[PDB]
Every structure is written in C-alpha cells, then in structure tokens.
UniProtKB/Swiss-Prot annotation:
The chain holds residues 7 to 147 of 355 of the full protein. Monomer. Residues 11-141 form the Galectin domain. Peripheral blood leukocytes and lymphatic tissues. Expressed in lung, liver, breast and kidney with higher levels in tumor endothelial cells than normal endothelium (at protein level). Expressed in trophoblast cells in decidua and placenta in pregnancy (at protein level). Isoform 2 is the most abundant isoform expressed in endothelial cells. Upon endothelial cell activation isoform 2 expression decreases while expression of isoform 3 and isoform 5 increases. Isoform 4 decreases in pathological pregnancy. It comes from Homo sapiens. It is found in: Cytoplasm; Nucleus; Secreted. Contains two homologous but distinct carbohydrate-binding domains. This is Galectin-9. Induction: By toll-like receptor ligands zymosan (TLR2 ligand), polyinosinic:polycytidylic acid (poly I:C) (TLR3 ligand) and lipopolysaccharides (LPS) (TLR4 ligand) and by pro-inflammatory cytokines IFNG, TNFA, IL1A and IL1B in mesenchymal stromal cells. By IFNG in macrophages. Up-regulated in dendritic cells following infection with dengue virus. Up-regulated in Kupffer cells following infection with hepatitis C virus. Up-regulated in plasma following infection with HIV-1. A beta-D-galactoside 1 binds at residues 42, 55, 59, 69, 76-82. The gene is LGALS9. Signal peptide: none annotated. Binds galactosides. Has high affinity for the Forssman pentasaccharide. Ligand for HAVCR2/TIM3. Binding to HAVCR2 induces T-helper type 1 lymphocyte (Th1) death. Also stimulates bactericidal activity in infected macrophages by causing macrophage activation and IL1B secretion which restricts intracellular bacterial growth. Ligand for P4HB; the interaction retains P4HB at the cell surface of Th2 T-helper cells, increasing disulfide reductase activity at the plasma membrane, altering the plasma membrane redox state and enhancing cell migration. Transmembrane segments: none annotated. It comes from the Eukaryota.
Length: 141
C-alpha cells in the first residue's frame, strides 16, 4: 500500500486489508515543541474511535511517560504505563509498529521500546489514526 504523505493531524486512514502478522507500520514526524503535552497513534477498527485495539500515547507530563491501552465498545481498559519517555519535544521521530501474532512491538528511532500483547483480535483492525501534539511527514507500510 502507498504511504500517506504529510497527512494533517488529527488523521485517520485505512490499512489496506487490515493488520497482518509481520506487517510493519512506520509513523515519521516531529513532536511539536510547544503545542500541548500528548500525542497518540491508534490502531482501530473503522473510523469511530470506540474500538481502539492499540492506543500508544506519549505524555510529556510528570516528567514524561507513555500510556498503552485498548478501548473496547467505548470503554478504556487497564493502562500499561511505560515510565520512560523516548521522545523529545521539538525533535523528529521515527516510530515503527511491528504486528506479531501475540503482540505489537514498538521501535522508536530504530530500537524496540515497548511490547503490547493483543487484547482483541488484530486481523480485524484496519485503520490508523493520529492526534495531538505532532506534525506528520509520512505513514508507510
Ligand atoms: C491514573 C489513571 O488511571 N489515569 C487515567 C487517565 O490516563 C485517563 O485518560 C485517558 O487515557 C486514555 C488511555 O487510557 C486516553 O489516553 C485518553 O485520551 C483520549 O484518547 C482518545 C483516542 O486517542 C482521543 O479521542 C480521539 O480524538 C481525535 C481528535 O483529537 C478524534 O476526536 C477521534 O475521534 C478520537 O478517537 C481523546 O481526544 C483523548 N482525550 C484526551 C483528554 O486526551 C485519556 O483521556 C482518564 C480518563 O479515562 O482516567 C484517568 O484517571
């Protein structure tokens, strides 16, 4: 599938034929230096945002942490927080999401940062959305 180039934020877009084992999604952009304190990459089913299989949510708050979570039928589940901020405000980033059968792995700037085990079946998620304090250069597959 062709990449989305300079998509405006907030973004959503379709992942052609859905998430698959071994699919790698790159999100390349810049964290804004002073336009808020959080951003999110969401892997979801459709365009509603009520069923987000994997919400990856860096927060430049309390010194900085990343929330990983799942929204199901409009309900957020138990957060998995990573008390490690691998981003810097104002700086470019390259995020890579590797879909595996049991989990997502998230590489930040080349290096595995977090592992999130599937809470809902992944082959059904077909949409990426991005919101918050970021500018995007591209999303590639
Ligand atoms: C200590 C503790 O338990 N803390 C809890 C808080 O962390 C918690 O905050 C919520 O946490 C969830 C993850 O658990 C999300 O980060 C929530 O933020 C919301 O995220 C959604 C999805 O990204 C976002 O909606 C999207 O917005 C875009 C455009 O911007 C568009 O409208 C899409 O349609 C939509 O999906 C939403 O805006 C965002 N809201 C905020 C305020 O960030 C986060 O609130 C709270 C509440 O559960 O509970 C604490 O106790």
């Amino acid at each position: 599938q062709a990449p989305y180039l300079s998509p405006a934020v907030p973004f959503s877009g379709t992942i052609q034929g859905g998430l698959q084992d071994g699919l790698q999604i790159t999100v390349n952009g810049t964290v804004l230096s002073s336009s808020g304190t959080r951003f999110a990459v969401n892997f979801q089913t459709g365009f509603s945002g009520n069923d987000i299989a994997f919400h990856f949510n860096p927060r430049f708050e309390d010194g900085g942490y990343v929330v990983c979570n799942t929204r199901q039928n409009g309900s957020w589940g138990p957060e998995e927080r990573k008390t490690h901020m691998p981003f810097q405000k104002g700086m470019p980033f390259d995020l890579c999401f590797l879909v595996q059968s049991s989990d997502f792995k998230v590489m930040v700037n080349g290096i595995l940062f977090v592992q999130y085990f599937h809470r809902v079946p992944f082959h059904r998620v077909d949409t990426i959305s991005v919101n918050g304090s970021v500018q995007l250069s591209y999303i590639s597959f």
